[PDB]
A = this chain, B = another copy of it.
Amino acid sequence: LSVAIIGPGAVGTTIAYELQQSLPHTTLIGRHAKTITYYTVPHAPAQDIVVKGYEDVTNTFDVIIIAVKTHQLDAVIPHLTYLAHEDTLIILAQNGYGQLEHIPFKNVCQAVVYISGQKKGDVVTHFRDYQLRIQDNALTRQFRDLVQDSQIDIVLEANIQQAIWYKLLVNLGINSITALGRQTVAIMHNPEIRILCRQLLLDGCRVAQAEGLNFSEQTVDTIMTIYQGYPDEMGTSMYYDIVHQQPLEVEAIQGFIYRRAREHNLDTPYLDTIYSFLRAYQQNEG
């Protein structure tokens, strides 16, 4: 079992570093060959990790982990013809729930990613966590055993939908507020912001229910409690994106919840307003 990671961003690089320690043939792939500086934690000693360009790959892989941004997914797909074979397990180490439809392979899996860090130029700094939550099946189970000497934590879920929706909602509240606010978590000091944040999660909660899940006001509480644990100066990925004038992962997150809202013909005023500012940002950035 051979393993490639596509997308030398923060998540992809962490996964590659950690897997490479016990599984040295594990390949990190991007657009161009290069060397990346990686820090397991801020101020730890520098480590080198090699990136291989698509052109440079000569073999196929039994497992492919895709870790680009959600909006970069389509650009990756055509390379899978040269990297994958028919039975290749394709794991999406990506936020939200992406355009899986677009991926022409038997074995595709949206993971839920709990791995934090940042990329700045060719420098990646990991912060905390090494976790991937994936659908239980014989392929993912085989992968979990392969990685048992690493600290990458593969959690196999009987039904991955719930895990996906839960993280959708954790992102929905704080990412939306910090990005549209152009502010760090400090923005949560405003009581009107906290109320909005709560209402936004209830909107998402109502969509989750319509999709089959027993999320409740209590679920909302646990999320608001996760948020209180955040420090004031913490940003979010979507906040960072908006501030550096980059595209957003909106379509796979807020966009995904919005589309499921219209499908079930629901009333989601907070979600709609947040989604429309986000979308309008995308259209201008583009």
Chain A interface (Cβ < 8 Å from any Cβ of B) = 180-181, 183, 186-187, 189-190, 192-193, 195-196, 199-200, 269-270, 272-277, 279-281, 283-284
Contacts and interface: CB of A to CB of B under 8 A. Distances in A.
Copies in the complex: 2
Nearest to A279: B192
A281 B280 CA distance: 19
Given A200-B273, A270-B273, 14 more contacts: A180-B180, A180-B277, A181-B280, A183-B284, A189-B283, A192-B272, A192-B279, A193-B280, A196-B272, A196-B276, A199-B269, A199-B273, A269-B273, A273-B274
Contact of A280 (B192, B269, B270): B192
A265 to B, nearest CB: 15
A284 B183 CA distance: 9
A189 B272 CA distance: 16
Nearest to A274: B273
A270 B269 CA distance: 6
A246 to B, nearest CB: 15
A280 B183 contact: yes
A276 B192 contact: yes
A277 to B, nearest CB: 6
Contacts of A270: 269, 273
A81 to B, nearest CB: 35
Contacts of A195: 272, 276
Nearest to A278: B192
Contact of A276 (B186, B193, B283, B284): B193
Contacts of A277: 180-181, 193, 196
B273 A181 contact: no
B275 A181 contact: no
A190 B273 contact: no
A136 to B, nearest CB: 37
